[PDB]
Amino acid sequence: TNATSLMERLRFPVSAQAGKGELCAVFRADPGRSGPWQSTLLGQLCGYYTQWSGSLEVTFMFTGSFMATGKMLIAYTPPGGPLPKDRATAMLGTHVIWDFGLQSSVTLVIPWISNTTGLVSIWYQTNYVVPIGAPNTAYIIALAAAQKNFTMQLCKDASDIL
């Protein structure tokens, strides 16, 4: 919350010092509840509303060094399955291969989300290693959008301000 740390908020750093740990823990996907979704436009739009349903998509692009080699994998756990204790429980769910030769054409789609639901977790697929004369830190950019199948049913007389 410091004043002189304002610009670094927009990303999250990643370093090679950490080994096979845990990158980010996305909270339960709910625009109505608190979390990352309150900043989005749809979550504010839902502030007068109750029931929502639709599809979710995520896009990732890789911004590493020109000589580096490795493999990244992003998977979403389907509903029913609890939080992944092991990578074996993660592999049974839908997973997409992320090569470093293809940047952003990878598309993952969650068929249906309503309001209970599944969870998404991100682990270190493998440690990013570089030889001498290369930076020891990188950054990752993420994307999130919704499909055409978003609809609204019931209006609510609720105002979140103030």
Binding site: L6, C24, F27, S34, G35, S39, N149, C155, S159, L162
Partner: protein, 225 residues
């Protein structure tokens, strides 16, 4: 989608809520002259301006109804008639102004026992449509280095006000309580812009203070689950 009959846009915009409140003190110090003028200032309240600020180009007519009662909900047989002065003519300042004698201004009179009043006024502003934002100098004069004598008070942008008087030889002896509801008739927007997230400090300026705020801090630490 499959069926879009229940998803009609009708419920997406139509919402009536309290916007204004006009008091008529029988004596006072803020208003010791016994009469008050209320210009239609949408920007006055933050909560309503939040909905409106998503819109940039709009022109529409207005519909208002007036209700008066007591804090206990009892009804009284009192009749009022409302007179409107075009925005072009200046608003009255003292009681001895000529605005009360103007016959050229149209008026409509209705009672209270009748069904609720429905009145509409046309768009009389000389411009094409209202503009909430203006990336420049608001004055439309050929002079671009000095300032007008009437700086600060510029009724050339609003839509005028109403005058209220009591029928009878003597002044009224009961104060009234009145609430006003506001709505839009036509909805048409062109250029979408973001809304506001932090609070407002001044009424006519969006300036901020040195105590910055953060949208949320619910997560105790991002490292853990």
């Amino acid at each position: 989608s499959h069926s879009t009959a229940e998803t009609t846009l009708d419920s997406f915009f139509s919402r009536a809520g309290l916007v204004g409140e006009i008091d008529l003190p029988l004596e006072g110090t803020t208003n010791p002259n016994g009469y008050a003028n209320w210009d239609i200032d949408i920007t006055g309240y933050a909560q309503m301006r939040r909905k409106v600020e998503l819109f940039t180009y709009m022109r529409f007519d207005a519909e208002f109804t007036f209700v008066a009662c007591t804090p206990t909900g009892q009804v009284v047989p009192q009749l009022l008639q409302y007179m409107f002065v075009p925005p072009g003519a200046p608003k009255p300042d003292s009681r001895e102004s000529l605005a009360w004698q103007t016959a050229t201004n149209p008026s409509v009179f209705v009672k209270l026992s009748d069904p609720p009043a429905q009145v509409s006024v046309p768009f009389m502003s000389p411009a094409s449509a209202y503009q909430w934002f203006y990336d420049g100098y608001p004055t439309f004069g050929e002079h671009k280095q000095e300032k007008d004598l009437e700086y600060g008070a510029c009724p050339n942008n609003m839509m005028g006000t109403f005058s209220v008087r009591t029928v009878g030889t003597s002044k009224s002896k009961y104060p009234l309580v009145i609430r006003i509801y506001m709505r839009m008739k036509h909805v048409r927007a062109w250029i979408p812009r973001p809304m506001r997230n932090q609070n407002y400090l001044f009424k006519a300026n969006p300036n901020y203070a040195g105590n910055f705020i953060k949208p949320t801090g619910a997560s105790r630490t991002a490292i853990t689950t």
